[PDB]
Amino acid sequence: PKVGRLIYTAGGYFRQSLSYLEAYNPSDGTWLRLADLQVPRSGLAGCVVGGLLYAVGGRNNSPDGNTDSSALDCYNPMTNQWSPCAPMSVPRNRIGVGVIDGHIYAVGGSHGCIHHNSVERYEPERDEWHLVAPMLTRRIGVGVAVLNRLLYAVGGFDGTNRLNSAECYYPERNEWRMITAMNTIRSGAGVCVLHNCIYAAGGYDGQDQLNSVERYDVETETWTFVAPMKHRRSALGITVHQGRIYVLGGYDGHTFLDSVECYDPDTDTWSEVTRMTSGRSGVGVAVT
């Protein structure tokens, strides 16, 4: 007939940083091989704006060596072609990304030693990055959600410590306020909004990868736990599709997962729904 919306998953890591762009049809159970990244990379972040998929930051961890990426690259699903864009002010391994109003927010990540608390806004219409109010905490492996046109930044790693702290950027006032910390410390968790709530799923607490999932209600300002995920996973991809959450791969201290679970809010149940062609951590994921 025709084909609807897809969960794109881009780059990642298994033995080395990867180039795989693949897509999943949640309504047919099927997986698409699509154009490889110009450069392989891991701990990048994915987002869509106006039909187009964007691949932000990360690092090429090669057999040869490794480089932290300041690169922004754009995938057009119409042409199956990547094009490069204005690079960021700085390279951002383990970046967090949110989209408010056709604009991309790159928050935190590392340039080797330097753990960032800087933040930059990219305007596709101009093809231009601009620095904005930095966060209060330095954070890499930071979950990033956009709720009621605010950017929430959740957990991460400040260079010394793993955080359960979370803050909130106000685009209109250009300022950051701390919010209720989560029950659990979570570096490299997966974070998104669904039916008006931030969810934090998986992550490394500093000892052990997690399968616990807590959600923020912005009104009651509390972090209630919900159903854990089947598999413990850190450095996982996450997205929302058809009002359900999908978690894609990641690491569990032993092996690189290929599992993808799916959370029905309506019935507070998870369920495994496919595998990825390979097991990989630190993929970037988005829907269009």
């Binding site: 890591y13 961890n61 492996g141 790693f157 490299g188 690189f256 630190g282």
Partner: peptide, 11 residues
């Protein structure tokens, strides 16, 4: 030589 969190080997 391993990153406990990402599972990436470094050095």
């Amino acid at each position: 030589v391993i990153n406990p969190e990402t599972g990436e080997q470094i050095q």
